[PDB]
Amino acid sequence: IAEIYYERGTIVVKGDAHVPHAKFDSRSGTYRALAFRYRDIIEYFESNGIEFVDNAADPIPTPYFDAEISLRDYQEKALERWLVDKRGCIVLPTGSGKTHVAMAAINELSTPTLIVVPTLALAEQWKERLGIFGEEYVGEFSGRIKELKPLTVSTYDSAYVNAEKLGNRFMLLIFDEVHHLPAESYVQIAQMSIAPFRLGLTATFE
């Protein structure tokens, strides 16, 4: 029987020996893939009607969100385009409409979400902004506090260092790229996360 599980930011696959992007690891005697390949491996099992056990994903229990989705027309335009693959980047003119489309997305897919923002300061803002979902579901994971709520905002720093710990607890990954972040900060965090849904955010202005 097919089974997968997570560790050190990688997916271990037992059973199927022809799983995509999974390579054989002679040290362990197993196939292994970077955690972000999680989604592909899943769609591979399901698509081929293959039976499997998911010991990889360990989703934080998240409620059904149904709050005030107030966006601008162009803001709601993109959201719907990103909703097709739920794995892309969104460029927005505004900037407060960035922290807006994000909110919208979270609300649509009521799944555990990690929000990576540079600087604590910017995290503090996002927390109190996520409150329109329930202050009790909003957490912060940083050098200041390491809490894991269904909606946790983290700093590029804290997220990079605890990739092991955050990697399999979220299904939706959001990057608040303020002027964009390093291909060693940004890229590295993404790669070790199993999160099948990714949303990168940038504000042309400010």
From Swiss-Prot:
Residues 79-206 form the Helicase ATP-binding domain. Coiled coil: none annotated. Disulfide bonds: none annotated. A motif (DEAH box) lies at residues 176-179. ATP binds at residues 92-99. Residues 1-57 are annotated as: DRD domain. The N-terminus (residues 1-217) binds dsDNA with an abasic nucleotide but not DNA with 5-hydroxyl-cytidine (a non-distorting lesion) or undamaged single-stranded (ss) or double-stranded (ds) DNA. The DRD domain (residues 1-60) structurally resembles the mismatch recognition domain of MutS. The C-terminus (residues 236-434) binds ssDNA and dsDNA. The C-terminus binds Bax1. The N- and C-terminal domains are joined by a flexible hinge region which allows the two domains to rotate and form either an open conformation (no ATPase activity) or closed (has ATPase) activity. Forms a heterodimer with Bax1. Belongs to the helicase family. RAD25/XPB subfamily. ATP-dependent DNA translocase which moves along double-stranded DNA (dsDNA) in a 3'-5' direction, unwinding the DNA. Unwinds DNA with a 3'-overhang but not a 5'-overhang or blunt-ended undamaged DNA; does unwind damaged blunt-ended DNA (cyclobutane pyrimidine dimer or thymine (6-4) thymine photoproduct). Binds single-stranded (ss) and dsDNA, as well as damaged DNA. Has very low ATPase activity that is repressed by Bax1; Y-form DNA and a DNA substrate with a 6 base pair bubble in the center stimulate the XPB-Bax1 ATPase activity about 6- to 10-fold. Conventional DNA helicases unwind DNA by binding to a ssDNA overhang of dsDNA and then translocating on this strand with cycles of ATP binding and hydrolysis to 'unzip' the dsDNA. XPB is believed to be an unconventional DNA helicase principally because it translocates in a 3'-5' direction along dsDNA instead of ssDNA, thus it is referred to as a DNA translocase. This is DNA 3'-5' translocase XPB. The gene is xpb.
